[PDB]
With several copies, the nearest count.
Chain A
Amino acid sequence: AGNAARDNKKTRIIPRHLQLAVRNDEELNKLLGRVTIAQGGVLPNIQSVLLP
């Protein structure tokens, strides 16, 4: 979460940083696959065929 906050260059840890920390790590993704995180959203990924 601190690494994700530094990528966003924020000092305080917000729930977006925690959600990014959980979803970015594959081990944490498998551990918390059935886990819903409030105020966090999802990963900002775009499918390959979506871009024109």
Chain B
Amino acid sequence: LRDNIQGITKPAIRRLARRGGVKRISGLIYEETRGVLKVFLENVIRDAVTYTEHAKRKTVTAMDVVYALKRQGRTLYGF
């Protein structure tokens, strides 16, 4: 698996900014948003990996993702 950071497409980031009420979207916001999302995923998925390794499980459940989001003050409901 290589070049998967480009899976988050440019109109996907455009629609995400449209949900946030952004009037105009620059052409350099896409790489920065991809980097921010990569950093956030590299934190949350790593925390979920530690949670799964603690429980002697080989696949990561949604509850561990919920715990990893909750421990950083970003708690998620519905899972």
Contacts and interface: CB of A to CB of B under 8 A. Distances in A.
Interface of A: 15, 34-39, 41-42, 45-47, 50
Contacts of B78: 15, 37-39
B21 A46 contact: yes
B21 A45 contact: yes
A50 to B, nearest CB: 5
B23 A35 contact: no
Main secondary structure of the interface of B (DSSP, over half): loop
Interface residues of B, number: 12
- Kindly list the 3 A-B residue pairs having the minimum CB-CB distance in the complex, ordered from nearest: A38-B78, A36-B76, A34-B73
Given A46-B21, A47-B21, A50-B21, A38 B74 contact: no
7 contacts: A36-B74, A37-B77, A38-B77, A38-B78, A41-B19, A45-B21, A46-B21
